[PDB]
Amino acid sequence: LPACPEESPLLVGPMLIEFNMPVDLELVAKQNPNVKMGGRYAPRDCVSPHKVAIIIPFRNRQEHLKYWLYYLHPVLQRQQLDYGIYVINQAGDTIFNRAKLLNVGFQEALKDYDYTCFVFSDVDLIPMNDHNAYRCFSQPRHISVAMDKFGFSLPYVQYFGGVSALSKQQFLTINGFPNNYWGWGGEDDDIFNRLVFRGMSISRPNAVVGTTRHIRHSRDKKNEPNPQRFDRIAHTKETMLSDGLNSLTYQVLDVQRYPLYTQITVDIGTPS
Template identity: 65%
Template sequence: MPGDSSVNFSVLHRICKLVVLLCFLHIAVTVVFYVRSFDFRVAFVQNQQSNYNIPMFRNTNRVVSSGLEPAKEEKVLEQPVKKLEKCPETSPLLGVRENGAGPVSLETGAFTAGTSSLTSTRVNKLSRKTFRHRDHRAQPYNRATPENRVCGEAGPSGITHTTRLQNSTPPHNDQDTVRSLTILERLSSIDLPEQQKPGALYNSGESEPIFISGPATSPMGPLRVEFNFSVDLELVKKENPNVQPGGRFKPKDCEALQKVAIIIAFRYREEHLKYWLHYLHPILQRQQLDYGVYVIKQDGNDTFNKCRLLNTGYAEALKEYDYNCFVFNDVDVIPMDDRNTYKCFSQPRHLAVSLDKFNFRLPYVQCFGGATSLSKEQYLKINGFPNNYWGWGGEDDDIYNRVASKGMSISRPTGEIGKCRMIRHNRDKMNDPNPQRFNRIAHTRETMYKDGINSLKYQVLSIQKLDLFTTITVDVGKP
């Protein structure tokens, strides 16, 4: 019995030693892995910085505008680095509009939808002092001068322009400051062709700014449209001093997204036209379009032919300018949202989606009237519009059939953005419903190749370049 107790105690003693040894080993392994894990995170951050060519700003002497203590300064500077795992799709180099537009696209230079916390005032003296875009240097200048503007910043006439780097007072939001700085320095290392650098502020050796594309959308949003007041065209002209004779406007400091001819078929609607000019000129300028307004007036008192007038407007507008987009707008239809851009898209665009006349609903899927846009290629693909619709009704459905027969679809904004108001009015004289419209709609596919822009006949009687629009009076014949 005593011998057995000695053996059992010896075994127990060895087991205890083994357990203690395993505990120490476990602690050692835990410490080693913890240290290795810590080292790995540091290495990862360093590798991440090297990939983006962004140095770690641990030198507190480098940042002097925030007023933080060194320890707090270092902590703030490390935070934005963690967010740079992917290259951002947009660049804050030119700032964003403080009234709601998104940042400038790095690829196109155009404004994107959405909002950003980075504004022009946050790209402050710090970022301008540190940032050097290749051989180009941001020079201080007077913000008030027109030549210092690019599309996106609000100008004296209410037109929006993009702001460049400003010599403004450093903001108190230091995290945004550092985020601006780090992104700006990363952009400085991107090797882009000269003509594709949205951030190149000046040409080499010159002070001439490089133009960028205008914004994709206007930042104004919903508008209040009323018709309970009289419109003075002289006042409209004073409120739109940048509109040239003939209703032409072209952004001075940027390249417009498209060249747009806006064509209105017209007769007996002088008051409606005044409202249209009052509301649309400011909208179109805020959308930074290179545009012209053409009012095609049918001469005489014979039956009205809307589509023949629209085809005439297309042909006459191209004689004046190299337009690549055409908007066909009824004179009594006014958009209620700035974001309903009067430009062309990859598919024919129906702009007047939600009319107040129909309780702001699309009356039927095939509806394609009120306000539409087609590119030059799309227009020619469907052979323009039919010339044989005399009187009211049917032509819009015929155009829809032409679009569908060519395998194209109708593009529309959302019902909210596509809201429009229609001016209430009685039907015009000599514009009675077309009794043949249903039969013609049924045979669109057979007639569209011989009835359209290729068969258009008209006679121009006069062309007047007025202050806010070009009026072309034509004789389109009789039914």
């Protein structure tokens, strides 16, 4: 098989996105026949240089997840990616830890296949243009750059939350993500700091191609704003040396291979 072309010729650009209808994953699976068990796909006509594991931090967001799957699967295939979907489900009902779940995703997906690119995406963000590439670049990539909830622009220029892509080397270089941001906020800013402290810069598509829709929702219980966040992001340079992949432990309770994704249910504990 020859290599796929540098840019996929299958892209259609701007798309219509809506979240007012019901979604049936059995149907979605039917519409996406080429997606194999566990939400895995690779083009059959060419070899993709992009081996992407898409990691979604998750707990009690099944409805959002169905929309995510309905919209992303067709887009990822048009992008001719060799990819896999991983939903990292936080076991239990104690305070949520978005970034720690993302580290679990990185470590566990690597046990399945030689992925060399990682896309970290919240479950309620849908790209509006398939030219917004869900793969890695020479520098860390911020993907959800123009979200409707932020008026189709970045909330601030150093904002790196929502959807992003880091190559395996970029992720390893920053010792992954922090494990101690419990509850909402700051962990994405900490990650931005990590990248800067390791000599990297943020790469982004333009505002139009990067347009993204956020499924408006209510505040989830157990993910209250972390009061220590402003304090923690001010010391990233020092804390990133000892807090991240090199200080991570967790216990996988279950791994389910659904037609459109792999769900890893994991116990990531409580604050220490």
